[PDB]
Amino acid sequence: MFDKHTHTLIAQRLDQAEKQREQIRAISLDYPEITIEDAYAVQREWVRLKIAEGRTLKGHKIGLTSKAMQASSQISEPDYGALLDDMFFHDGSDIPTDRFIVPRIEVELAFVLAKPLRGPNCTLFDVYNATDYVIPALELIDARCHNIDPETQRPRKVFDTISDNAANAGVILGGRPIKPDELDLRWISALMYRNGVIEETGVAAGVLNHPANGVAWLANKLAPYDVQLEAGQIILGGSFTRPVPARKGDTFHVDYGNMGSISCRFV
Amino acid sequence: MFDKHTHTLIAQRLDQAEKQREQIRAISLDYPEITIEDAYAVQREWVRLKIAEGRTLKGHKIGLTSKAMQASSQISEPDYGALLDDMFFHDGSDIPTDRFIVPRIEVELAFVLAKPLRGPNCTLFDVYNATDYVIPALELIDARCHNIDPETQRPRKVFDTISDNAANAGVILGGRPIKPDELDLRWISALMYRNGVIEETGVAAGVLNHPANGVAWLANKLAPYDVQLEAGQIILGGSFTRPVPARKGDTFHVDYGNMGSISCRFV
Amino acid sequence: MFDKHTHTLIAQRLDQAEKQREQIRAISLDYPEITIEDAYAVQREWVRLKIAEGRTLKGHKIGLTSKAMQASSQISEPDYGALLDDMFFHDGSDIPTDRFIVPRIEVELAFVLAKPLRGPNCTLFDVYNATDYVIPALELIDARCHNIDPETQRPRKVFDTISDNAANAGVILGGRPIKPDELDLRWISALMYRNGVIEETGVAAGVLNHPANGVAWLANKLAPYDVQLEAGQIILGGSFTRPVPARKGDTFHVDYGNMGSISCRFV
Amino acid sequence: MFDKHTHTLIAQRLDQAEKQREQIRAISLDYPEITIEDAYAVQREWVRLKIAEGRTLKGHKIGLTSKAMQASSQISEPDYGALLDDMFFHDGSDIPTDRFIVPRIEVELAFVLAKPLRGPNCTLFDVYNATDYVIPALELIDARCHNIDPETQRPRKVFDTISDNAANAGVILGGRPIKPDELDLRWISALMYRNGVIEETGVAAGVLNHPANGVAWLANKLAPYDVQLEAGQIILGGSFTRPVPARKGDTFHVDYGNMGSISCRFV
Ligand SMILES: [Mg+2]
Ligand SMILES: [Mg+2]
Ligand SMILES: [Mg+2]
Ligand SMILES: [Mg+2]
């Protein structure tokens, strides 16, 4: 494990990559001895830097939820990253494509907390008690590191993703807010349209068998750092679709059936 | 368009590939001038051979329904193949892995016809009127041609798949039979488990915007050949999930919610 | 009744049996005058030892919840055991078969407590008041004593099972969490699949007429020992199916209908 | 295979066994080379004799509808028997215990045919088309052959059960008649009470994955004998519970929830 100053240097390089919209070499290639603990330490430093610049923490996301993507990576559980205020775009918004590098859209559910959640021993049941509203949410993900020879599996890529604030870039909330007990969250389903054609469909149970499961897991991950999920935070639970590339000119419309819809346009 | 003898020659080679469980070189590589008309002519010949051997036509399938698949296959419409009696396995069956080469499982809805459907001008409404029951159905697909050839590493094409009876191999019907009008077919959703873990999820609208659409399209495609979809036939409308590889020892469970489930095990 | 030292030494022998995956002779054959209270004292010592090793108490289970199972065990009421943190597996997990001796799977409902339950005079209504959520739960049960005695061929007795922490080994929570008032718990039903075939089915009322009844009974049983069911504990109420053997390679899928599903694979 | 005369004489012996309520030696022990087809031939002769006496065929039952029951019977498919008019008792009837030898109660769904079903190629969909109503049904089963051989202690075999008209003795229809399309038959569930205590519970999908599947299977089994399922016949599809012994003084109550109940008392 590296000393903090190494984590800070890597964070500064990610920060410049984001600002210039120019990718850097995969962190795990430049730092072949990097550990998962180092990766989260890099993330923490970068988030710290971005908050010092004037951003505010608004929540978190859980990623790498599919067992398939978990299997091919160096780890055997999901990942997480921090959501900042400048990542949020309004339902129906024009999104500036130029701000991103290789943006892709994911289909998720978000949990808006009424009460804090703290580990250890946080459970699904604690999540239900603490959740004010569940609402559909799109995530816009991106990559500040190059991915060389993408067809060749390289498990240590997960360290890059984690360092790179779990690929965070954007969030679009929309549709129908519900109390968590209103209906069975496992069977919420969605159709993702891009430019008027369905590109992906999915069902929420594809996220960790229950789309709220990652929230409890996250609270438990954060506990050792003396961090909790705070009241008012928005927690994105994970995607039940493969991400779909967003290009300038694209319009997205994601239909969650009786849970409403979310739209945006890339300009 | 190749001569009658050449179609039969290709069909016999596909037939040998299936019987021996030994893939042949892509048809498009040995025959670079192959057209889509040729491909269907080859399929017809192979089906003729297999019926002459003692099999019976039980229905048809529609494939290449997604936008991802149509673009990558370089085609602007779906494909189709013929379903024979020996392709059908019972719900909950042991499936002999050794019978197949590279089997993969798809998640579909099947339409069981009470009345014939004939083109041209077959509509979605005709399909509703002619359908006795809709039932969940898994398709087991396979490939008798190499995906990447030993000699040149060149990829397999859409002509190869179509010639190869649209990748047909197996069908597993199960779950809950319904009249077409019982509920909105567009929103039927499914969770595909392999070995207890969700590998894919999907919603039926991902099949041509309405899972009955392919049935009408198919009747219209067959009209020129003086062929119709016959009463009693089972028509598989297309997959709302990417295919998932089946290996010896795998248990599949596909949960269609209020439409029931289908299971099998590869032995 | 035996002295405290004997309870401790029997518990140590069971602990070694579990650790080494090697069964010991039925305790009741070595100790012909063993009482039900002795059996619970052995259980308490074993739980104490495991907690001393760093384990944490997470809840309890109730067993022998059929009049038929009670008759076979020559007892007139259920039994209970303690659930420790290391017994819990995630929904969809690989379960290490080598960790167990003769594992079997049961189908249950779990009660997650928001408030403590203390005897005497704990009622069904107290259980409803104290329960935060009900969630489907599988129990993985095992046996550290021989069922058929190597020397005498005589069978294991209820004293052996109770001493052996009521056959406890594993727990798998999954599916849909509900408030106890959401629907009639009595009519929750389930299909247990092993390797894609239904091995057992059952309905929750098969557990003591109402799956919450065992929880009240348990609180009342524990009162004389100055023990109560604590807030945050998970209480498994009993199986509505006969247990089904788990072997290496087995995939389990348990379908509780509108209450969701739980799966796992033995590896 | 035995000659026709032997089938007749075995049937006469079973007929006397039933009349006298005195078991005979297991047929398979007297006839070690007995085949499944011999067993069905004995059954056919017995049915013929009973009809000659003035009885009328009212339908059929399907048995051994579990993979587990099939394994115990060393068979790879269900069995069947014929239901005669004098086997039917009214809901809430006193049942004369003295008429039977070792009676046991099973919990089933019955299919009342509006149209005939003939093999080969009878499907689930044909069953739905031909079924007028589905109604809960209890089966009273019995055994005219010793389970444990007086001389050798050897057990009864499947050939014995099939010869013995598939253990047929009584049928009790009751509860709520529904059109097959009214609800999902797979999820009909039941609680069997004997003397006010639940002895078994079960769900209809436990019968061959779908309680109508046995009906199609049966039509296909009967086709080679130039027999079909006739309009107006009642077909019992299989038990979703293990049979429960009936003794003089026993009251049975079987609760199918929203499908109604069936009761009887043994006197
Ligand atoms: Mg995401
Ligand atoms: Mg298909
Ligand atoms: Mg249990
Ligand atoms: Mg029966």
d(Cα C76, Cα C74) in Å, to the nearest integer? 7
Which site among B189, B199, B244, B258 would you substitute to test the A interface, given the most A Cβ atoms closer than 10 Å to its Cβ? B189
Q: C186: closest CA among C216, C200, C217, C207?
A: C207
Binding site: which residues of A?
Answer: 106, 108, 139
For residue B92, list chain D residues with Cβ-Cβ distance below 8 A: 67, 209
Domains parsed from chain D with CATH numbers: 1-267 (3.90.850.10)
Please report how many Cα atoms fall inside a 13 Å half-sphere around the Cα of residue C121, on the Cβ side: 0
- The residues on A that touch B, with CB distances below 8 Å, are 66-68, 187, 189-191, 197-203, 205-206, 209, 240, 257
CA D65 to ligand 3 center in whole angstroms = 26
The closest alpha carbon to D215, from D86, D134, D111, D137, belongs to: D111
C-alpha–C-alpha distance, residues A118 and A133, integer Å: 18
Burial of D5 (0-12, 13-18, 19+ CB in 10 A): exposed
C53 is in an annotated binding site: no
Cβ–Cβ contacts within 10 Å for residue D190, how many? 28
Q: Do B253 and C195 touch (CB under 8 A)?
A: no
CA distance A190 to chain B (A): 7
Tokens of D161: 């059960």
Bridge partners, residue A260, by sequence: none
Q: Which residues of D touch B132 (CB under 8 A)?
A: 125, 129
The DSSP annotation for chain A comes to ---HHHHHHHHHHHHHHHHHT-PBPPHHHH-TT--HHHHHHHHHHHHHHHHHTT--EEEEEEE--SHHHHHHSS-SS-EEEEEEGGGEE-TTPEE-GGG-SS-EEEEEEEEEESS-B-SSS--HHHHHHHEEEEEEEEEEE--SB--SSTTS--TTHHHHHHHTGGGEEEEEE-S--B-TTSS-GGG-EEEEEETTEEEEEEEGGGTTTSTTHHHHHHHHHHGGGT--BPTT-EEEEEESS--EE--TT-EEEEE-GGG-EEEEEE-
B contact chains, 3+ CB pairs < 8 A:
A, C, D
* B–C interface: beta-carbon pairs under 8 A: 43
Minimum-distance CB partner of D125 among B91, B112, B174: B112
- Please indicate the experimental technique that yielded this structure: X-ray
The rounded distance, in Å, linking the Cα atoms of A145 and A93 is 27
Q: Cα(D218)–Cα(C163) distance, rounded to whole angstroms?
A: 50
The packing angle between helices D4-20 and D36-52, to 10°, is 60
Lookup: tokens for C199: 């091995």
DSSP state of D156: P
CB contact under 8 A, A67 and B199: yes
Residue C108, annotated as binding a ligand: yes
SS3 C3: coil
Q: Which residues of C have a CB under 8 Å from any CB of B?
A: 92-93, 193, 195-198, 249, 251-253, 255, 261, 263-265
Nearest to D184 among B112, B179, B260 (CB): B260
Ligand nearest to the CA of B79: 2
Is the CB of residue C98 less than 8 Å from the CB of residue C249?
Answer: no
Within chain C, residue ranges assigned H as helices are: 4-20, 27-30, 36-52, 67-72, 124-130, 158-163, 213-222
Task: Decide if A151 contacts A65 (C-beta within 8 A).
Answer: no
How far apart CA B139 and CA B109 sit, in angstroms, is: 10
Compute the nearest-CA separation of C179 from chain D (Å). 22
Resolution expressed in Å = 1.7
b (16+ CB within 10 A) / e for A3-14: eeebbbebbebb
Distance between CA atoms of residues B2 and B5, nearest Å: 8
What are the Cα distances from residue D109, in Å, to A217, D168, D171, D197, D218? 45, 16, 11, 22, 15
Distance from CA of B26 to the nearest CA of D (A): 37
Pairing of strands D168-173, D251-255: unpaired
Chain C to chain D Cβ contacts (< 8 Å): 50
DSSP assignment of chain B, as one string?
A: ---HHHHHHHHHHHHHHHHHT-PBPPHHHH-TT--HHHHHHHHHHHHHHHHHTT--EEEEEEE--SHHHHHHTT-SS-EEEEEEGGGEE-TT-EE-GGG-SS-EEEEEEEEEESS-B--SS--HHHHHHHEEEEEEEEEEE--SB-SB-TTT-PBP-HHHHHHTGGGEEEEEE-S--B-TTSS-GGG-EEEEEETTEEEEEEEGGGTTTSTTHHHHHHHHHHGGGT--BPTT-EEEEEESS--EE--TT-EEEEE-GGG-EEEEEE-
Structure tokens, C253: 């899928």
* Tokens encoding C178: 């509900």
Q: How many CB pairs below 8 A link A and B?
A: 48
Residue pair C215/C229 in contact (Cβ under 8 Å)? The answer is yes
C92/chain B closest Cα distance in angstroms: 5
Q: Closest chain C residue to D192 measured between Cα atoms?
A: C206
* Side chain identity, residue C75: I
Chain D residues whose CB is inside 8 A of the C191 CB are 203, 205-206
Touching subunits of D (3+ CB pairs, under 8 Å) are B, C
> Pseudo-torsion of CA B158, B161, B164, B169, nearest 10°?
-160
Distance C3 CA to ligand 4 centre (A): 54
Per the annotation, binding residues of A for Mg(2+) are: 106, 108, 139
Query: Which of A179, A181, A60, A183 has the alpha carbon at shortest distance from A114?
Result: A179
Task: Give the Cβ contact number of residue A63 at 10 Å.
Answer: 25
